[PDB]
Amino acid sequence: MISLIAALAVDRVIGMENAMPWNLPADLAWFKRNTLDKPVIMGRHTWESIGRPLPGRKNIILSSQPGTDDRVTWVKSVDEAIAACGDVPEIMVIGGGRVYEQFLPKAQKLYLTHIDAEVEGDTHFPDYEPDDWESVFSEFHDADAQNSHSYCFEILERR
């Protein structure tokens, strides 16, 4: 099964041209904990912004163009991305917007970080219907000396 993992601000904003104006080490620890040892599928832009292969995981980058880093796996389509994952318990799709859009319809689980932040952005997580998902886990956190905003981690299973 396929899972999508994303950090969302108000209005489902997930990205913009510049760096997001927040500091959330807690979300990154959560992202790492949930993706370690699993294949992670990302779009070329996310790859670019991550900047290096993520350690301890099989990195698969979607691009219409030839790959420029032999350390990772480049694919030209959804289906190839999937086949490149092999026979594994769970595949993690890490972004970005165009990628989430194509994978949502095939995902069985959502790992979301809701951030209490109003940011202007040009990329959004796709619209999803709460009633199609069962919130199986949730945990609210206030901002602290390390985290600039309050956030909440939620795990949804498709009904």
Ligand SMILES: CN(Cc1cnc2nc(N)nc(N)c2n1)c1ccc(C(=O)N[C@@H](CCC(=O)O)C(=O)O)cc1
């Ligand atoms: C920009 N980007 C994509 C990114 C960032 N936060 C997200 N947060 C969530 N919840 N979900 C995503 N898909 C997500 N994606 C990044 C940037 C850096 C690292 C990164 O260094 N992660 C290390 C963790 C490093 C650290 O813990 O500081 C890892 O090992 O996963 C990951 C994703």
